[PDB]
Amino acid sequence: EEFSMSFTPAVKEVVEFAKRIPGFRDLSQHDQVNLLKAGTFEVLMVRFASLFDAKERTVTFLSGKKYSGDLLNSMFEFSEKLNALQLSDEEMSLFTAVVLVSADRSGIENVNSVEALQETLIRALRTLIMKNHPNEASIFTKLLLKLPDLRSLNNMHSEELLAFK
Numbered sequence: 001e002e003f004s005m006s007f008t009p010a011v012k013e014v015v016e017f018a019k020r021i022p023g024f025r026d027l028s029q030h031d032q033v034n035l036l037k038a039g040t041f042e043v044l045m046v047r048f049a050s051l052f053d054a055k056e057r058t059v060t061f062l063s064g065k066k067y068s069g070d071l072l073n074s075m076f077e078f079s080e081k082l083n084a085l086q087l088s089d090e091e092m093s094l095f096t097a098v099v100l101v102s103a104d105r106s107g108i109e110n111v112n113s114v115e116a117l118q119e120t121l122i123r124a125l126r127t128l129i130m131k132n133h134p135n136e137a138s139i140f141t142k143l144l145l146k147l148p149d150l151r152s153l154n155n156m157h158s159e160e161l162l163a164f165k
Contacts, residue, residue, distance in 0.1 A: 006063040007044065008165045013062070014040045014100070021097045023117045031108050039103030041158045042150040046096045049079035071157040078153070082146065085139050088132055094125045095143055102147050104154075 018024050018036060025032070051060040054076070060066045087095065101118045108114055129140045 002063070002065070002067075003061055004165050006061045006165075007161065010044055010047065010062050011040055013047075014043050017043070017096070018100055021101070021117075021121070023120065024101075027113050027117065028110055031110055031114060034107035035100060035103045035114070038107065038154075039100045041154050041162060042099050042103065043096050044161075045075065045078060045150055045153060046082070046092070046099055048075055049082045050092055052076070052079040052083060054080040054083060071153070071160060074153055074157075078146075078149070085142060087139075091125070091128055091132065094121065094128055097121050098125055098143075099147065099150060104151070 057068045098121045126140045133139050
């Protein structure tokens with residue numbers, strides 16, 4: 001409850017976010033549906049982190065209200081680690097687009113076009129991180145390391161979410 005349904009309109013939000021990713025609407029319709037089908041779960045993981053605060057033990061839901069079981073524990077270790085980097089909203093958005101365009105390539109027909117879009121987003125992320133965190137370049141590396149982590153959480157818990165919310 002009070003979090004079940006909270007992730008239904010969130011799916012609608014990912015679709016709209018993707019549409020705003022420069023170049024996304026150039027990929028085949030086939031590839032756009034597949035990136036969203038495969039990556040929506042990983043983007044939602046990042047969005048959750050963004051609505052968490054281990055610095056105050058508060059978890060805010062896209063729904064509004066604020067509060068403080070083994071996926072939920074993973075979502076906390078994940079969120080704490082990511083929240084540690086102290087990214088700005090702009091970095092957070094760019095990173096989320098990288099996550100979406102980094103999704104499982106199994107159902108993708110034009111991988112070259114998807115890798116080309118990921119490259120463009122990756123280069124901007126690194127460029128944007130170096131500028132806002134000149135002495136913390138490593139922040140960029142830590143973010144890439146999270147891609148394999150999110151793919152595992154996905155492989156393991158997507159079903160217990162991508163089902164009736």
